[PDB]
Amino acid sequence: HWGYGKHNGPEHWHKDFPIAKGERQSPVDIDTHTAKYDPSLKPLSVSYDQATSLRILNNGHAFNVEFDDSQDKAVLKGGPLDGTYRLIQFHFHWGSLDGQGSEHTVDKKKYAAELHLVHWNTKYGDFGKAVQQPDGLAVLGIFLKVGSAKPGLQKVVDVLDSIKTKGKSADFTNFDPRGLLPESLDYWTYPGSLTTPPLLECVTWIVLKEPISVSSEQVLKFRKLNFNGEGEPEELMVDNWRPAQPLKNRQIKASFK
C-alpha cells in the first residue's frame, strides 16, 4: 500500500488514486508575489475554547490527535468559509532534516514541518460525508521552523513514546490546540485536496503566514516514531510529506497585504 518510501511514495499514488493527477491537488507552492490580496476576505474565527481532545494514534503515516466532533466544541468559521467547520483531528508532516518536511512551500522554501488542523463542514453531518463534497473540509495549515521550543507542543512530544509504532493509540485528554497557533492569523487560501490518499478534492485550505517555532529536541522526537508496526522491520517515520503539485486553474488569495 501507499507510503513515502522508494517504491510506494507520492509519485506512485496515482496508480491507486487517479485523482492524484487531478485539477485541485494539494499541497502547492505559495508564490507570495502572485497571491492576490482579497480585501473582502474576513478574519478567521478560531473557537477552540471548548475543545475536547480524546486520543492520539499512530496510523502508520503520521499521528493524529483526535477530538470529540459530536458537538460544536472547537470550530473554525469566517475567513473564506461559509458555515461552521468542526475540528476532528490534527496531525503533522515532517522531515528527516530541518531543511525539509512541509507540504506547502512559500516561494519554494520548505519548512521543517507542517501542522494540519482538520475541520469538516457541519452541514454534511459527519466527516465521511464531508470528504465527498467540494466544500466539505477546511484545513488550517501552520508551518513549523526550528528555533525556540513551543511549550504548547510538549505534551504531544511527551506521549510519542507510547505510540511509537503503527496501530498504537493512547489516551490524550485535555490538550489545548490554541497552544499550537502563532500570534497572527493572516493567511493564504485556495481550493485543494487531502494530501494523503484518498486525495479527495474537498478542502478549503487556509495556510497561516506566520510559522511557529519548535526546538531541535521537539522535532527530533517526531523523527523517532516508526512507520511500521511493532515486531515489523523498523523504518523511521520521517519525510512523510507530499511535494508541491501543479496549481493548474487556481488562484491563491491572501488575507493581508
Curated annotation (Swiss-Prot):
Changing residue 64 to H: Enhanced proton transfer. One of its GO terms (molecular function) is cyanamide hydratase activity. Changing residue 89 to P: In OPTB3; in Czechoslovakia. Keywords: Acetylation, Cell membrane, Cytoplasm, Disease variant, Lyase, Membrane, Metal-binding, Osteopetrosis, Phosphoprotein, Zinc. The keyword Lyase applies. Zinc. Can also use cobalt(II) with lower efficiency, but not copper(II), nickel(II) and manganese(II). Changing residue 198 to A: Normal CO(2) hydrase activity, but impaired stability. Changing residue 59 to A: Reduced activity. Changing residue 194 to A: Reduced CO(2) hydrase activity. It is found in: Cytoplasm; Cell membrane. Changing residue 61 to A: Reduced CO(2) hydrase activity, rescued by 4-methylimidazole (4-MI). Reduced proton transfer. Enhanced proton transfer. Enhanced proton transfer capacity. Changing residue 141 to R: In OPTB3; complete loss of activity. Activated by X-ray, histamine, L-adrenaline, L- and D-phenylalanine, L- and D-histidine, L-His-OMe and beta-Ala-His (carnosine). Residues 1-256 form the Alpha-carbonic anhydrase domain. The record marks 4, 59, 64 as: Fine-tunes the proton-transfer properties of H-64. Changing residue 59 to D: Strongly reduced activity. The keyword Acetylation applies. InterPro entries: CA_dom, CA_dom_sf, Carbonic_anhydrase_a-class, Carbonic_anhydrase_a-class_CS. SUPFAM superfamilies: Carbonic anhydrase (SSF51069). Substrate binds at residues 195-196. Belongs to the alpha-carbonic anhydrase family. Interacts with SLC4A4. Interaction with SLC4A7 regulates SLC4A7 transporter activity. Interacts with SLC26A6 isoform 4 (via C-terminus cytoplasmic domain). It is linked to Osteopetrosis, autosomal recessive 3: A rare genetic disease characterized by abnormally dense bone, due to defective resorption of immature bone. Osteopetrosis occurs in two forms: a severe autosomal recessive form occurring in utero, infancy, or childhood, and a benign autosomal dominant form occurring in adolescence or adulthood. Recessive osteopetrosis commonly manifests in early infancy with macrocephaly, feeding difficulties, evolving blindness and deafness, bone marrow failure, severe anemia, and hepatosplenomegaly. This is Carbonic anhydrase 2. The lineage of its organism: Eukaryota, Metazoa, Chordata, Craniata, Vertebrata.
